[PDB]
Design a protein around this ligand. Structure first.
Ligand SMILES: [K+]
Ligand SMILES: [K+]
Ligand SMILES: [Mg+2]
Ligand SMILES: [Mg+2]
Ligand SMILES: [Mg+2]
Ligand SMILES: [Mg+2]
Ligand SMILES: [Mg+2]
Ligand SMILES: [Mg+2]
Ligand SMILES: [Mg+2]
Ligand SMILES: [Mg+2]
Ligand SMILES: [Mg+2]
Ligand SMILES: [Mg+2]
Ligand SMILES: [Mg+2]
Ligand SMILES: [Mg+2]
Ligand SMILES: [Mg+2]
Ligand SMILES: [Mg+2]
Ligand SMILES: [Mg+2]
Ligand SMILES: [Mg+2]
Ligand SMILES: [Mg+2]
Ligand SMILES: [Mg+2]
Ligand SMILES: [Mg+2]
Ligand SMILES: [Mg+2]
Lengths: 258, 67, 53, 185, 144
RNA sequence: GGAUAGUGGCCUACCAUGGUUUCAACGGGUAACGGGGAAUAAGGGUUCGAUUCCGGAGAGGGAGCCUGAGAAACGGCUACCACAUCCAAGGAAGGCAGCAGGCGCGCAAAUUACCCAAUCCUAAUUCAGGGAGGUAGUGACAAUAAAUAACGAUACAUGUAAUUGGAAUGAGUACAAUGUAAAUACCUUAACGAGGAACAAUUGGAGGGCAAGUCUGGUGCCAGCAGCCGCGGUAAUUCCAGCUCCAAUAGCGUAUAUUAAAGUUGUUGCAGUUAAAAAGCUCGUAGUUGAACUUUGGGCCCGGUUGCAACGGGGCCUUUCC
């Protein structure tokens, strides 16, 4: 209505953020940025609600303006910067890195990682196109454009991004039997292996995924993120590895600690 | 009783990071006495009318309404 | 036919109330009812009555 | 504006306002358990009806259904934890068969009587209200407390509240202050 | 058959027939036509203020007697004139000509109550104070 | 072709005569903003949804437009219309359906308070601003919890009463502390703060429906009550009162609307001889509905679930193939 909205009412924020209902009338609206509004995690939320380093937004800004936080290797002093899937958030003080991956329940889990693999990050190839002057380029899920990609890289593949030079180091192909993260839908946060890809020309492509426990679910091609091969994920998986325990076995796991 | 506590590594960082109201509570840098919010808003609204500095218009005011 | 609008209430003898001890309002009144009904304070009058005569 | 705050009613009034048998049974319950008004009975009946409805909706599903199993065992777990349900009869069809007195017994006001802390149910209610009873390290002045079957062994007088504590009271202090002169000095 | 279509594709006739026959219900017709807004001196409201124009003695219907001491009231909202019962022993002495009175319904949604013919309203307040609080000695009517 | 950011009768020129409609077009009404939802609900439903979130639209009514990425913006401009304000009469200036607040309207709705401390937003931006927002005030909208007593001793028959005692405490009040942005309040506590504990619970009822009086005085078809049936005509269980009792109880009553009850709207699931209702009769288009028949039945397997049996599934032949 007359221009872009700048506010985000609470109860209109993404549910994954696990924001308190009766805290205020508003939630941090993710600024324009690499990933998305709904699919992102604002740095204020990651710093105050997931890690409890800052007590409020003022302390979040105090953290960010003294150049502690760093997203994908860059300082990113923006409080509502939309850090999203597979972004690397390194804090030099309290020296540690996190990889923004989805837990089994679909929330952006706090996933502590070491520097030797925080060096890079993975990116799903959103599109492959010819740029100006006939230069090919790859657009990844995080809005990155990388020129002169390997001529064998197609859409729905994954590329390992150096994150120091922003170049392609390795690339995984979307194919049957490759490890996939689910980055949307009901099965968000689940990890499995591709069983089949149904084409549906003009429609949406479907893909069948078998997790390690042999549970098979079908989801749209839009929200499957290749992360490697069976047993060999190119990233450090979170505590649950995308197993999707039912509520009964979850209760059994909880009550196994007595 | 249950509360929350912070131990800053030094009083310098404590002064830098603590909210001013908590500092005023403790005894550190004290409350700055600004005018009431209504008076401050009225003052800025008054200042919104005069375009430049007020002295050059005060000269005209004195000249006109002094005969 | 107006002007008879007080033929009874006006000419009703103005008996004042009777000062009596207050009643034990609340849980105490529930106690009073329980003792007055269920612990056999005799009001049977065949099966069960609640007012004298 | 901020998100709305959810609130619910905790009771339900009877459909027939003047059923003689229902009124007599309610007064019997009130006398037996030292209840202030019929609203406490209404609240207990409302909770019991909610529990029975949940049990019926579970029973209407085929046995060994995941939802039936999960929510059922949750319901028995909660009921045996509060004490209303019997350890022997954990099959949810003996949840269907619960009664209001089962919940009225697990009251803190009822338990203070049943443990000898008070000389009447109404004395127990008064003791709870006047900040004399603690459950653990916690004074509880709510007569409807639903002792969790683990606080039953721990219900005792408070460290404050000079009946099981160490203080001299208030009217006793005033009586002693006046008796200091009343003795002659 | 039962005189109504049963075919799997007769939903249109079923719903149109129900629509046509719902007009025979009093409340549905009143609600859909908005009679209470056009008719119904209280223009769909529970209470209404008015000015007492005259005290009336309305003879009660058979088998009763004892004329009922109503008042004719002209509503401020719309100017319509209605007759309102003044309920209690007395309480007509508390109501005067040109007094402002709050009127409520008689509990029957029209269809005048009891043995009072043609009276569908009752006086609740006069001069801004409760008729019941005036019948009791709690309050006194303001001077006018 | 023009115009637009761009598709498009969006507009223009020529051309064709099309397009919608009883499967309800078009027109009219709506005391209609839509939805997420709400009330009630055995099932099926009925009703509501201005209003905390989402979408739309508007800023007195229209229209036009500038700037700008984005506005046909109104706490921007221009004009007309309607209101309406200052004036020295020359002129000039407006838009609370933002927050308070006032008038009016009405049955019907609160402070011209404090603050950016939280939530977030904006900006050149850690700092400033924010009636967004939060805090408190008013507040029996609604919801939660639940004080108004508990326990002994005397006298009589577990109870009884103006026979008495020791306890218990919060309702308040208040040092302090905490809570707060500064407070208030809650939580916690020094001291004070019960005896007809007057620190005194009400609102409706007592013929039936419907729990509770054949008690007393008053009135005498009057006054009045009474949702309905009824009660009152000089022995009123119904009015006006006293006493007593009943119901709910910090609530209770009244009016209106609505839901269940209502199988009194009926798809589930009504009724139509006589209670309301079969068209006077037949034809007939739309609509609804419409006889039976085309691979069935053997067999061989593999194989999952429950505990060899049952139940499910897949495959081969059998004139068949997937
Ligand atoms: K008559
Ligand atoms: K009569
Ligand atoms: Mg839109
Ligand atoms: Mg064209
Ligand atoms: Mg509507
Ligand atoms: Mg409208
Ligand atoms: Mg709405
Ligand atoms: Mg309206
Ligand atoms: Mg809106
Ligand atoms: Mg607009
Ligand atoms: Mg206006
Ligand atoms: Mg405009
Ligand atoms: Mg305005
Ligand atoms: Mg605006
Ligand atoms: Mg009181
Ligand atoms: Mg009486
Ligand atoms: Mg009865
Ligand atoms: Mg019928
Ligand atoms: Mg007939
Ligand atoms: Mg015939
Ligand atoms: Mg035909
Ligand atoms: Mg057939």
């Amino acid at each position: 209505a007359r221009g872009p909205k700048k506010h985000l009412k609470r109860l209109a924020a993404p549910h994954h953020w696990l924001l308190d209902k009766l805290s205020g009338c508003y939630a941090p609206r993710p600024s324009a940025g690499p990933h998305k509004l709904r699919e992102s995690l604002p740095l204020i939320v990651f710093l105050r609600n997931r890690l409890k380093y800052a007590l409020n937004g003022r302390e979040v800004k105090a953290i960010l303006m003294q150049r502690h936080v760093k997203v994908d290797g860059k300082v990113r002093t923006d409080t509502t910067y939309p850090a999203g899937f597979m972004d690397v958030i390194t804090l030099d003080a309290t020296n540690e890195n996190f990889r923004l991956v989805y837990d089994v329940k679909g929330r952006f889990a706090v996933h502590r990682i070491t520097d030797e693999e925080a060096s890079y990050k993975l990116g799903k190839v959103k599109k492959v196109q010819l740029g100006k002057k006939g230069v090919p380029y790859v657009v990844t899920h995080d809005g990155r454009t990388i020129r002169y990609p390997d001529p064998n890289i197609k859409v729905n593949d994954t590329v390992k991004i150096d994150l120091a030079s922003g170049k392609i180091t390795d690339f995984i192909k979307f194919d049957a039997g490759k490890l996939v993260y689910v980055t949307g839908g009901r099965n968000l946060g689940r990890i499995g292996t591709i069983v089949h890809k149904e084409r549906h020309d003009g429609g949406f492509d479907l893909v069948h995924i078998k997790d390690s426990l042999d549970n098979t679910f079908v989801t749209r091609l839009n929200n499957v993120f290749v992360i490697g091969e069976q047993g060999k994920p190119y990233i450090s998986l979170p505590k649950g590895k995308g197993i999707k325990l039912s509520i009964a076995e979850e209760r059994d796991r909880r009550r196994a600690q007595q | 009783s249950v509360g929350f506590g912070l131990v800053y590594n030094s009083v310098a960082e404590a002064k830098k990071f603590e909210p001013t109201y908590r500092l005023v509570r403790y005894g550190l840098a004290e409350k700055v006495e600004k005018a009431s919010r209504q008076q401050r808003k009225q003052k800025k609204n008054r200042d919104k009318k005069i375009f430049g500095t007020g002295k050059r218009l005060a000269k005209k005011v004195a000249r006109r309404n002094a005969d | 036919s107006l002007a008879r609008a007080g033929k009874v209430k006006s000419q009703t003898p103005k008996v004042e109330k009777t000062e009596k001890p207050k009643k034990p309002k609340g849980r105490a009144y529930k106690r009073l009812l329980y003792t007055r009904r269920f612990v056999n304070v005799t009001l049977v009058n065949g099966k069960r009555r609640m007012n004298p005569g | 504006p901020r998100a709305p705050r959810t609130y619910s009613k905790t009771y339900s009034t009877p459909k027939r306002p003047y059923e003689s048998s229902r009124l007599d049974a309610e007064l019997k319950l009130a006398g037996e358990f030292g209840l202030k008004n019929k609203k406490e009975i209404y609240r207990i009946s409302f909770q019991l009806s909610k529990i029975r409805r949940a049990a019926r909706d579970l029973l209407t599903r085929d046995e060994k259904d995941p939802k039936r199993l999960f929510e059922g065992n949750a319901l028995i777990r909660r009921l045996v934890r509060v004490g209303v349900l019997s350890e022997d009869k954990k099959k949810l069809d003996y949840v269907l068969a619960l009664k209001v007195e089962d919940f009225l017994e697990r009251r803190l006001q009822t338990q203070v009587y049943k443990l000898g802390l008070a000389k009447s149910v109404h004395h127990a209610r008064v003791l709870i209200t006047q900040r004399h009873i603690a459950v653990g390290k916690q004074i509880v002045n709510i007569p409807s407390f639903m002792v969790r079957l683990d606080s039953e062994k721990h219900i005792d007088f408070a460290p404050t509240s000079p009946f099981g504590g160490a203080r001299p009271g208030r009217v006793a202090r005033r009586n002693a202050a006046r008796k200091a002169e009343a003795s002659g000095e | 058959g039962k005189g109504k279509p049963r075919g799997l594709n007769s939903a249109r006739k079923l719903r149109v027939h129900r629509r046509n026959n719902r007009w025979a219900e009093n409340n549905y017709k009143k609600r859909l036509l908005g009679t209470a807004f056009k008719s119904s001196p209280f223009g769909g409201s529970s209470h209404a203020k008015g000015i007492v124009l005259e005290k009336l003695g309305i003879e009660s219907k058979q088998p009763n007697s004892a004329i009922r001491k109503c008042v004719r009231v002209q509503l401020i909202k719309n100017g319509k004139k209605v007759t309102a019962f003044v309920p209690n022993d007395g309480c007509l002495n508390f109501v005067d000509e040109n007094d402002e009175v709050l009127l409520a319904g008689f509990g029957r949604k029209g269809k005048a109550k009891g043995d009072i013919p043609g009276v569908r309203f009752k006086v609740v307040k006069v001069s801004g104070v409760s008729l019941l609080a005036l019948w009791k000695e709690k309050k006194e009517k303001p001077r006018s």
